[PDB]
Structure formats: structure tokens, C-alpha cells
Amino acid sequence: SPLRIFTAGGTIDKDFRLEENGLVVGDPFVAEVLKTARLAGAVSIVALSRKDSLDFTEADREAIGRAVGQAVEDHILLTHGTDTMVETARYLGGLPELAGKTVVLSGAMVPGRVGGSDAAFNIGFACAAALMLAPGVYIAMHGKVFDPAKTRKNRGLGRFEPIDD
Amino acid sequence: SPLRIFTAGGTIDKDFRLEENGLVVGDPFVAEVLKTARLAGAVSIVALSRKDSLDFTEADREAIGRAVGQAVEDHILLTHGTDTMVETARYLGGLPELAGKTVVLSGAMVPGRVGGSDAAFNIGFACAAALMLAPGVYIAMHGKVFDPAKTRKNRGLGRFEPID
Amino acid sequence: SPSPLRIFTAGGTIDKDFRLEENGLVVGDPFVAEVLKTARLAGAVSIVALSRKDSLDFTEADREAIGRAVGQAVEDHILLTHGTDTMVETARYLGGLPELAGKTVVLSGAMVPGRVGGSDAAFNIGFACAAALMLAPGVYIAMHGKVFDPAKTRKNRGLGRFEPI
Amino acid sequence: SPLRIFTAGGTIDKDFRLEENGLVVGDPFVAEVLKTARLAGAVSIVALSRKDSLDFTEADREAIGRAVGQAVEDHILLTHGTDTMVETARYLGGLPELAGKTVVLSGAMVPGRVGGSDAAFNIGFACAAALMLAPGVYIAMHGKVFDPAKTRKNRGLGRFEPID
Ligand SMILES: [Cl-]
Ligand SMILES: [Cl-]
Ligand SMILES: [Cl-]
Ligand SMILES: [Cl-]
Ligand SMILES: [Cl-]
Ligand SMILES: [Cl-]
């Protein structure tokens, strides 16, 4: 397919580890969504890192820039935590190796393995956005496309919204 | 630009009824998917019919053409059963009142209310396709866009594929 | 330390599964195996499939075959998963068999298939397993978080519930 | 015959709060399991406290003893976190107001709102156990009944086991 999928952990991939009575960043949830989507080929993703927003580092962010630049595909999906998605998307937007590529960041406010998740919808929408949008770096959430330069995460209302005018 | 959703029943919307001890075509599952999607914009969901592929008629297919034609929006998602999705899509492609509209048909091989369903992914994918594709009539399934004129449903593989 | 419990499956609503090629439900693999897989059980328990019928296709020959299998079991604690529409008739028939004299036999199932959202199946299986281990010798129906005497019970098909006669 | 159900929080009740990106102890999951169990009457529970195993106190434990002793019912289910369950069960075992009551503690190693949870099976089994066992205090987990004086939680293996 023309699409390459990268994962950088975050809320979307959280799973319960019963040995510590708490969530960890687990197996990439996009693999679980694509498993039941009846795709033509084997499910194929790249798992870059498995951090949550607290232990994600600038080194982890540069590693994403290098992985995406080395991909041969020009249509790119990156699943990520929402708390520092804008920071990653603005960083990728300044990399010249990404000039001709459509790069879409998405994830979920609720882990896929928790009831009532936005994850599967967001993954479908984001896959289609990555295929169909003109070259650029975008955030796809809430069934819409956000310009990362003009967007912030509101942690309190769990949503992306326009920056302060 | 705003999306309008029309529903025509099919597998995607099947639900268990205790008294039938069996499935019936239920409330549109797209509304359940959009509920947990934390949407930025308002989306109208209009139910045109609640049939399965066995009791969906040519009269039902004409009624969908009339409702899509009367829609003010140029971005339309229609949820439908897969067994005759190609026939509906080919019919809508022939209608002059759909010039300038992007109309995407989608649905699910497995009911949304059954474990292991393609429905939520296919709804996300088809919503974006309806917003982003140029005017025309399309089928969005298997994370791909199909041209209805060059596509068929393989019943046994439970897949859409190119003719040839 | 093996469970005193043997589980027999005879099909019914509990086990219904969606088949793509038919665009509808068929009686599938026993849902009790899926529930016990996530139950973290202490004791080994045998699940034996006797039949894969719904209540519409069930015969007097099938019921006689179920009575022979239960009677031949070594265990004195038996769970039988079954459709609800013919449960009372199976339970009354098992109640008449001398080979079942020393045994606790509990029939249960679900009004909604395990594999459909909003199912009573996992609750019913937990309740019925405990009932089969703890009740005095006899034949019982376990549904609605209660124990029913088959001779004094019927299925109200309209209300989708077992009730006193 | 009548069962009284009390909840004290723990793993079974954890729910994701998207405003903090983490789990909190939430609405008692037993209400969700009983909702789909098609019971004869309204689902009725007593929500005593909403601690996890790390914030639960000997005062919270004594408050459960007072609540269970005030119940008119002689069949009692208490949902609880597993890491503190043996100490609660042993404490209730010592209370004279509980002498003629069957008191069953249960819960789940995985929250009910996370996929692949033991919660619904465990509630079904423990409801039956509370109705059927002789007076005493018991832990119902792993499809069997444990004597709390002879039992410990193995945190690493997520299981109750004999001391042994
Ligand atoms: Cl995160
Ligand atoms: Cl259909
Ligand atoms: Cl049946
Ligand atoms: Cl069916
Ligand atoms: Cl806990
Ligand atoms: Cl957490």
C-alpha cells in the first residue's frame, strides 16, 4: 500500500498490567484496529517508542523525524499521545526530508483497550486523511484536520482547539 | 465543509432481538461510533430505510437517489449493506442531481454490535473520504477507495475487488 | 487440583456467532470457553461439546443423547449450556433419569449471544458454575441470578425470562 | 434469599479519566454487570468507599464492618480491591454482628471497563456463592472459594493462593 504507519505509544496504546494494578504503554492498538479492518495484505507497522507523555524525550522526537524521513512512502500515519502531539507535529513540519510527504498525527483521548474509546474511528479517519491530503503535517482528531501551527491541546476539555488569537 | 450522513440499514446496523432470538436491522450504528468520536462539528444522520439485502427493493434504491439529490451538502456518507452496495453506487453515479457532490458508500461485513467488527474503522475512513475526495460516487471499504463501475463484491471472500 | 465441575455444551443463543458468507448468526463455538479463558481459573475444568443446535433445530434424539452423556460423566457437578426456549423440557427430562441421582446438574445459557454487545452470558456462566459446585443433588436452571426448579418453571418468550408457573 | 451488595472500590471499578490521562476508581462496575443480567428488580447496591489498594485505610475497613453489620440481609457480597481483600475478610471474620451472615468478597484482577476482564464472571460466581454458602466470610475468585485465614494474594502472579 502507499501508506506507512508509525507508532510512538501514548494514551491510545495503554493496557492494564494486572501484576502492577495499573496501565502501561502496550502493544500498538492500531494493529488491533487494522486486524479487523479486512485489509488486502498483512498488517504492517513500525513501532518507534513506547513512552507516555511524562517520559517522552526530545531524543524520542528526533528519532521520529529520522524514521519518517527515511520511509519511501509519501503517505504517513503516526499514532502518538495527545499531550505533546502538537510539539511533535510542529517539529516534523520544519524537516526538509518531509517536504513531499503527507504526515498525519493521530491517537486517542481514551485507550483503545478501555470501553468507549475514540481510537478505532480516529485510526480510520487518520488513515484516509494520510492518503488524501496534500503534502504537509496535520493532526487528525475529532473528525477533522488541524494545522499544528494554529492548534493547542486543551487537557481539561480533552480536545484540540485553535491557539489564543 | 459539512458532512451529512444517510443510513440505509444493512449488516453494519444489525442488532439482536430477544423475541426473534435473532438479528434484525436495528438503529444506525454510525450514531454510536460518532457518539464516542468527540466530534468538533455537528453531523445530521438521516435514516432513509432499515432493510437488509434480502428485502431492500429497487423502490428503496430510487428513494436514496431522491434524498441524496435533495441534500444541500456536497459531502455525503451513505451506510449500506455490502451485498448490493455496488448496484446502489452505480445507480447514484448515473444521477445528474449528484453532480458536484462527493458521495461515499460504506458499511461493514460484521455488524457493529457483534465482537470483531470493521464498522468503527470503516466509518472513520469513509467520513474522511466523503470530506476529502473530489466529486463522484465511491465505495470506501478495506481502507481503500473503489470506483463502483470497476468493482464487485466477492460473497465468499467477504471482500470488494476490481473486476479482473 | 482439578475442578469437581464438568461443562457440557449443547449450543443455543449463548453460542451464536456471525458468519460473513451467510450475513447472519449461526450456532458457533461454545462461548463458555471464551468466558473461562479470561476468568483466571484455579482448577482444571473439561468443556465437552455434545451438540451445536439452536432451539428451532433441536430434536428429542438430541435430548436423549444429552441425558446419556450426563449420566456417563464421573463428575457429580455438571453445567450444561443450552438454548433457553427448550431448557425447561431438557431439565425436566434430565430430572427423570436414574443415572443422574447423585449429581448436581445446572442448565444455563443467555438471552443475548456472548458475542453480541450487552450479553448476560459471562454473569450467567459465573453464577451457574458456582451453582453447579454448591447446590444439593438435583437438576436446576440458573438464570436471572436465581435458581429455578424446572418442574415449577417456564420460559415467558415475550418477557425473555424464566418465571414460576 | 435477598442479597445485599456493597462496593468498596478497587481494581474492578477503575475507569479512564481522559482529563488526567489515567485511571481513577469510578462508578461501581457491579452496577454495569447487573444491568445486563436481566434481574427481576432494579439494580440496588451500597457504594461505601472508592479507594484503591494504595489509599485504603484501617478506618475505611472498620466503616465496611459497621455497614455490613447494619444490613438486615444474611447474604452479603462486597466488591473490593484484591491486594487488601484478605485483611478485610479476616477483620470481618472477627465481628460478632456478622455471625449468622454469609459474606463473600470478590473483585477483579483487571478493571471491568478494560477488555479481557474477569469481572463479570467473578460477580456471577460470587453472587451465587453469597446465596449458597453456609454463614462465614469467604473470598470468591478464580472460580473457587477461599478461606481467608489460609489465603494470601500473590501480586506477581495475580492470584489468591494457600499460605501453605
Ligand atoms: Cl500519553
Ligand atoms: Cl444487509
Ligand atoms: Cl436457541
Ligand atoms: Cl441471524
Ligand atoms: Cl485496588
Ligand atoms: Cl493510570
XYZ file of C-alpha atoms in Angstrom, chain B residues 38-144:
107
model
C -15.709 13.534 20.432
C -16.605 15.338 17.130
C -15.748 19.053 16.540
C -18.705 19.603 14.134
C -22.463 18.831 14.031
C -23.451 15.853 11.778
C -27.025 15.125 10.683
C -27.758 11.370 10.443
C -30.883 10.752 8.327
C -32.391 7.234 8.236
C -33.745 6.509 4.728
C -34.575 2.777 5.235
C -33.873 -0.101 7.650
C -33.669 -3.097 5.228
C -31.206 -5.996 4.828
C -30.005 -7.058 1.338
C -32.968 -9.559 1.034
C -35.827 -7.027 1.486
C -34.114 -3.904 0.056
C -36.075 -3.022 -3.119
C -35.442 -1.111 -6.343
C -38.016 1.368 -4.924
C -35.784 1.815 -1.799
C -32.739 2.415 -4.119
C -34.692 5.128 -6.040
C -35.729 6.764 -2.703
C -31.998 7.033 -1.723
C -31.217 8.731 -5.080
C -34.009 11.283 -4.450
C -32.871 12.045 -0.832
C -29.152 12.387 -1.802
C -30.157 14.684 -4.731
C -32.251 16.971 -2.448
C -29.362 17.268 0.085
C -27.805 20.801 0.231
C -24.355 19.325 1.289
C -21.773 18.304 -1.326
C -20.169 15.777 1.099
C -22.406 12.723 1.751
C -21.744 9.412 3.557
C -24.291 6.606 2.960
C -24.148 3.474 5.232
C -25.478 0.395 3.387
C -25.256 -3.413 3.241
C -22.329 -4.751 1.182
C -24.313 -7.368 -0.827
C -25.826 -4.714 -3.239
C -23.662 -1.665 -2.404
C -22.113 -1.780 -5.946
C -25.636 -1.646 -7.562
C -26.686 1.343 -5.385
C -23.347 3.136 -6.030
C -23.603 2.518 -9.825
C -27.217 3.845 -9.816
C -26.263 7.042 -7.844
C -23.325 7.636 -10.267
C -25.917 7.974 -13.083
C -27.923 10.808 -11.414
C -27.328 14.387 -12.683
C -28.516 15.965 -9.330
C -25.387 14.370 -7.704
C -23.008 16.385 -9.978
C -20.614 18.313 -7.681
C -21.276 16.023 -4.670
C -18.757 13.575 -3.147
C -20.919 10.565 -2.172
C -19.198 7.672 -0.316
C -20.925 4.390 0.454
C -19.561 2.282 3.308
C -20.782 -0.239 5.851
C -19.387 -3.385 7.476
C -19.002 -7.132 6.755
C -19.658 -7.697 10.542
C -22.429 -5.881 12.478
C -21.055 -3.046 14.694
C -22.824 -4.651 17.746
C -21.018 -8.008 17.158
C -17.428 -8.502 18.530
C -14.588 -8.106 15.979
C -16.429 -5.607 13.647
C -14.808 -3.465 10.870
C -17.621 -0.858 11.460
C -15.861 1.895 13.546
C -12.715 1.888 11.311
C -14.807 1.939 8.132
C -16.940 4.885 9.470
C -13.788 6.934 10.303
C -12.215 6.140 6.927
C -15.467 6.880 4.970
C -16.134 10.186 6.851
C -12.667 11.483 5.809
C -13.137 10.164 2.217
C -16.555 11.968 1.951
C -14.838 15.275 3.136
C -11.641 14.909 1.087
C -12.430 13.158 -2.287
C -13.305 15.112 -5.481
C -16.944 14.947 -6.635
C -18.085 11.451 -7.689
C -19.562 8.254 -6.178
C -17.224 5.884 -4.287
C -17.163 2.789 -2.125
C -14.805 3.039 0.884
C -14.054 -0.420 2.359
C -10.850 -2.315 3.365
C -9.105 1.069 3.956
C -9.303 1.743 0.184
